Amino acid sequence: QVQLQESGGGSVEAGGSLRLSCARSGWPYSTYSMNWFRQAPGKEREAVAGISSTMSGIIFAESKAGQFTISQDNAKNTVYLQMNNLKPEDTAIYYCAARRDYSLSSSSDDFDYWGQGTQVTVSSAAA
């Protein structure tokens, strides 16, 4: 059985940082790509970042150079989403997703395996 186990979310102040982790276990294939998706309140689920067994990580979502960084630890079968300079509009449920195809895809329909979803809430600054 495939499991994608997420960790590392929660509440953060505007401007803060978080690193999400997704540990892949039970993977039956010699290849993969892994994505982080997110679903913000009232919005459709959208791709944030992708990485694969052959390609370095890319960020799909318009952000700013350094807002998101995706990486992986191959020995630990774990993919990471480093988030910096977080803003209220980064509040969302973040999802890990996996598929056999090692190209990079932003389409949720291409992914047959999903993590449980991790809430990230970015509070606002006083004004």
Side-chain angles (χ1 to χ4, degrees):
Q1 186 207 48
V2 175
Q3 290 185 48
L4 301 183
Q5 174 71 30
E6 300 158 9
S7 65
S11 300
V12 65
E13 302 296 306
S17 295
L18 286 176
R19 183 178 84 130
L20 309 184
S21 288
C22 176
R24 175 185 74 251
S25 56
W27 193 242
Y29 301 126
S30 60
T31 62
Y32 58 83
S33 55
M34 308 277 298
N35 274 24
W36 284 97
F37 284 86
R38 75 184 177 181
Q39 188 165 1
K43 296 200 167 194
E44 56 177 2
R45 192 184 266 176
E46 63 181 14
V48 181
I51 195 167
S52 87
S53 46
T54 62
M55 298 172 83
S56 307
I58 67 155
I59 303 305
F60 297 105
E62 190 259 13
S63 34
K64 166 160 142 312
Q67 188 104 345
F68 301 107
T69 304
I70 184 170
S71 65
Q72 66 189 326
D73 186 303
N74 292 85
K76 293 176 180 182
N77 296 317
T78 297
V79 178
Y80 304 102
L81 182 69
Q82 177 68 241
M83 305 206 294
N84 289 304
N85 191 37
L86 284 163
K87 294 306 159 227
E89 64 265 22
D90 295 311
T91 298
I93 308 174
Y94 284 75
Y95 298 89
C96 180
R99 65 185 189 136
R100 182 169 64 94
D101 186 334
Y102 51 53
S103 295
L104 300 172
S105 171
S106 64
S107 181
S108 63
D109 284 0
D110 289 342
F111 294 81
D112 286 351
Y113 299 96
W114 292 84
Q116 75 261 40
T118 300
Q119 177 65 42
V120 167
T121 310
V122 185
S123 295
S124 310

